[PDB]
């Protein structure tokens, strides 16, 4: 059984301290420039959901990684210059609802499956 565990798909970019006024919607809006809708993780308090200021975006594409990292590195959002670093993290299923809620918005695109019918 091979799922491609040697292939780091759980790779993503790390965004640094953002404005507390910035929400996941704003974050997705910024990445909408590249038109690549994939996983997005915003560090929010487990009780009140306070924006901790750390953002992550997991998209699968080696070309787009280096592109977005260099392109967004130094880009200002609300006065906050985006510092993009490389990092990898495996989403635990104990928090699947979070990532699922993310794909809930992406489902509008995910509906289009590969291979058109028979």
């Amino acid at each position: 059984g091979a799922m491609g565990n040697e292939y780091k798909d759980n790779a993503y970019i790390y965004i640094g301290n953002l404005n507390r006024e910035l929400t996941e919607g704003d974050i997705l809006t910024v990445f909408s420039e590249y038109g690549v809708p994939v996983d997005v993780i915003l560090s929010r308090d487990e009780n009140t959901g306070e924006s901790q200021g750390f953002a992550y975006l997991k998209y699968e594409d080696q070309r787009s990684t280096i592109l977005a990292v260099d392109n967004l590195n130094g880009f200002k959002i609300g006065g906050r210059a985006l510092k993009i670093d490389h990092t990898f993290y495996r989403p635990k299923r104990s928090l699947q609802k979070y990532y699922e809620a993310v794909k809930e918005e992406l489902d509008r695109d995910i509906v289009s499956k590969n291979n058109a019918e028979k």
């Binding site: 404005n19 006024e21 910035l22 929400t23 996941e24 919607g25 704003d26 997705l28 809006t29 910024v30 997005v40 915003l42 929010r44 308090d45 487990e46 009780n47 959901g49 200002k76 959002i77 609300g78 928090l95 609802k97 979070y98 809620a101 993310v102 918005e105």
Partner: peptide
């Protein structure tokens, strides 16, 4: 801490518009 021991976080896609004033 009865209401501080729960863990529930639901992504909220809202538009602040903070970046609108510079884009």
């Amino acid at each position: 801490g009865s209401k501080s021991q729960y863990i529930d976080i639901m992504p909220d896609f809202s538009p602040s518009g903070l970046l609108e004033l510079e884009s």
